[PDB]
Write an enzyme that holds these catalytic residues in place. Structure first.
Site, PDB file in Angstrom:
ATOM      1  CG  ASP A 134      -2.012   1.101   1.184  1.00  0.00           C
ATOM      2  OD1 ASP A 134      -2.278   1.723   0.133  1.00  0.00           O
ATOM      3  OD2 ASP A 134      -2.589   1.365   2.254  1.00  0.00           O
ATOM      4  NE  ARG A 138      -3.941   6.121   0.550  1.00  0.00           N
ATOM      5  CZ  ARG A 138      -3.955   5.688  -0.709  1.00  0.00           C
ATOM      6  NH1 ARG A 138      -4.047   6.541  -1.729  1.00  0.00           N
ATOM      7  NH2 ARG A 138      -3.906   4.385  -0.940  1.00  0.00           N
ATOM      8  CG  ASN A 139      -0.648   4.861   3.301  1.00  0.00           C
ATOM      9  OD1 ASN A 139      -1.411   5.480   4.037  1.00  0.00           O
ATOM     10  ND2 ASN A 139      -1.067   3.905   2.475  1.00  0.00           N
ATOM     11  CG  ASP A 152      -0.517   1.770   5.632  1.00  0.00           C
ATOM     12  OD1 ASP A 152      -1.067   1.076   6.520  1.00  0.00           O
ATOM     13  OD2 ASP A 152      -0.837   1.716   4.418  1.00  0.00           O
TER      14      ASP A 152
HETATM   15  C1  LIG Z   1      -2.010  18.075  13.093  1.00  0.00           C
HETATM   16  N1  LIG Z   1      -0.892  17.275  12.741  1.00  0.00           N
HETATM   17  C2  LIG Z   1      -0.985  16.185  11.731  1.00  0.00           C
HETATM   18  C3  LIG Z   1      -0.882  14.820  12.343  1.00  0.00           C
HETATM   19  N2  LIG Z   1       0.080  14.777  13.318  1.00  0.00           N
HETATM   20  C4  LIG Z   1       0.657  13.415  13.334  1.00  0.00           C
HETATM   21  C5  LIG Z   1       1.991  13.265  13.839  1.00  0.00           C
HETATM   22  N3  LIG Z   1       2.570  12.083  13.864  1.00  0.00           N
HETATM   23  C6  LIG Z   1       1.938  10.973  13.424  1.00  0.00           C
HETATM   24  C7  LIG Z   1       2.626   9.738  13.483  1.00  0.00           C
HETATM   25  C8  LIG Z   1       2.012   8.571  13.039  1.00  0.00           C
HETATM   26  C9  LIG Z   1       2.779   7.248  13.081  1.00  0.00           C
HETATM   27  F1  LIG Z   1       3.965   7.410  13.627  1.00  0.00           F
HETATM   28  F2  LIG Z   1       2.111   6.304  13.701  1.00  0.00           F
HETATM   29  F3  LIG Z   1       2.977   6.879  11.793  1.00  0.00           F
HETATM   30  C10 LIG Z   1       0.665   8.624  12.518  1.00  0.00           C
HETATM   31  C11 LIG Z   1      -0.004   9.820  12.456  1.00  0.00           C
HETATM   32  N4  LIG Z   1      -1.356   9.866  11.939  1.00  0.00           N
HETATM   33  C12 LIG Z   1      -1.958   8.680  11.365  1.00  0.00           C
HETATM   34  C13 LIG Z   1      -1.501   8.421   9.928  1.00  0.00           C
HETATM   35  C14 LIG Z   1      -1.927   9.278   8.900  1.00  0.00           C
HETATM   36  C15 LIG Z   1      -1.505   9.060   7.580  1.00  0.00           C
HETATM   37  C16 LIG Z   1      -0.642   7.962   7.301  1.00  0.00           C
HETATM   38  C17 LIG Z   1      -0.217   7.113   8.343  1.00  0.00           C
HETATM   39  N5  LIG Z   1       0.644   6.019   8.033  1.00  0.00           N
HETATM   40  O1  LIG Z   1       0.880   5.056   8.901  1.00  0.00           O
HETATM   41  O2  LIG Z   1       1.200   5.999   6.862  1.00  0.00           O
HETATM   42  C18 LIG Z   1      -0.632   7.331   9.651  1.00  0.00           C
HETATM   43  C19 LIG Z   1       0.633  11.036  12.921  1.00  0.00           C
HETATM   44  C20 LIG Z   1      -0.020  12.300  12.874  1.00  0.00           C
HETATM   45  C21 LIG Z   1       0.968  15.812  13.504  1.00  0.00           C
HETATM   46  C22 LIG Z   1       0.254  17.110  13.666  1.00  0.00           C
END
Ligand SMILES: CN1CCN(c2cnc3cc(C(F)(F)F)cc(NCc4cccc([N+](=O)[O-])c4)c3c2)CC1
Length: 274
Positions: A134, A138-139, A152
């Protein structure tokens, strides 16, 4: 069961439940505070898995502890005490949101570097025989040092944006149809070479600053669209050689596609030229 080297003391972690920073299908993501080994307070992201009720088999993403590379998201640990996953805080959220934000000014060269960074993470994952399944803008996450982390995967695997997924209904597999390699849409199986096709789409996302792929092709028709040899067009500001790299990623013959290692060479060369 021998997970002990990853367990975090509950009195060593503060989860700010009032501050949701993300919502996946398996549960929310909160801002958190972690006491590290050196005794310093650190920001972290805490992921709750409350939706998974019965079964544990998810925790067979524990292999992500063994992963270590600057462009792949590391696991800080798990806290038992709904089991919780503790991950590093990513200041700028997902790559795609960051570049879509009109109050940001990434240059053409920033955009290519983000692309190279991902290529490096995927290189690392490919060599560990890990297939992502995936990869998309966005990931990937972007920290304060503007370092991109491929995310992700493992304990962080979830859907954070269901808009682009179809759920198979026979297997329950989640399919991001417009990022999937041609052979994947047909057989529903995924390889490093299908990761390479998705990486191409990711690149295209970067150079358009997060435009939606194939906006005029509906989800059903995508397959004959690809069968006929049509592909994503070159973005206005994508240098010719980089588009050339994208086309290679979408060759109908998987074996014909470049490795992630070749992609690291080519993009790095492009990043330096001009
Ligand atoms: C308002 N802001 C945006 C989100 N914020 C964050 C900051 N850190 C994040 C770290 C994770 C992690 F380390 F688990 F990957 C995940 C966040 N949000 C869920 C997410 C959104 C889009 C993609 C993914 N992903 O695993 O690819 C995960 C996170 C979201 C920062 C401040």
């Amino acid at each position: 069961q021998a997970v002990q080297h990853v367990v975090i003391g509950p009195s060593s972690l503060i989860v700010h439940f009032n501050e949701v920073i993300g919502r996946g299908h398996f549960g929310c993501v909160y801002h958190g505070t972690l006491l590290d080994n050196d005794g310093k307070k650190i920001h972290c992201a805490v992921k709750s898995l409350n939706r998974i009720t019965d079964i544990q088999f998810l925790t067979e993403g524990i292999i992500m502890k063994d992963f270590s590379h600057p462009n792949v998201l590391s696991l800080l640990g798990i806290c038992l005490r709904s089991p919780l996953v503790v991950l590093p805080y990513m200041k700028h959220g997902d790559l795609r949101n960051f570049i879509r934000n009109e109050t940001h000014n990434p240059t053409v060269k920033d955009l290519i570097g983000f692309g190279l960074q991902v290529a490096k993470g995927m290189k690392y994952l490919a060599s560990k025989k890990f297939v992502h399944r995936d990869l998309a803008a966005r990931n990937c996450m972007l920290d304060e040092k503007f370092t991109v982390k491929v995310a992700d995967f493992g304990l962080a695997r979830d859907m954070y944006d269901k808009e682009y997924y179809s759920v198979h209904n026979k297997t329950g597999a989640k399919l991001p149809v417009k990022w999937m390699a041609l052979e994947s849409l047909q057989t529903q199986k995924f390889t490093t070479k299908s990761d390479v096709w998705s990486f191409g789409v990711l690149l295209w996302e970067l150079m358009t600053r997060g435009a939606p792929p194939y906006p005029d092709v509906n989800t059903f028709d995508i397959t004959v669209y690809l069968l006929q040899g049509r592909r994503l067009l070159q973005p206005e500001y994508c240098p010719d050689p980089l588009y050339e790299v994208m086309l290679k990623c979408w060759h109908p013959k998987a074996e014909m596609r470049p490795s992630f290692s070749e992609l690291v060479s080519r993009i790095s060369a492009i990043f330096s030229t001009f």
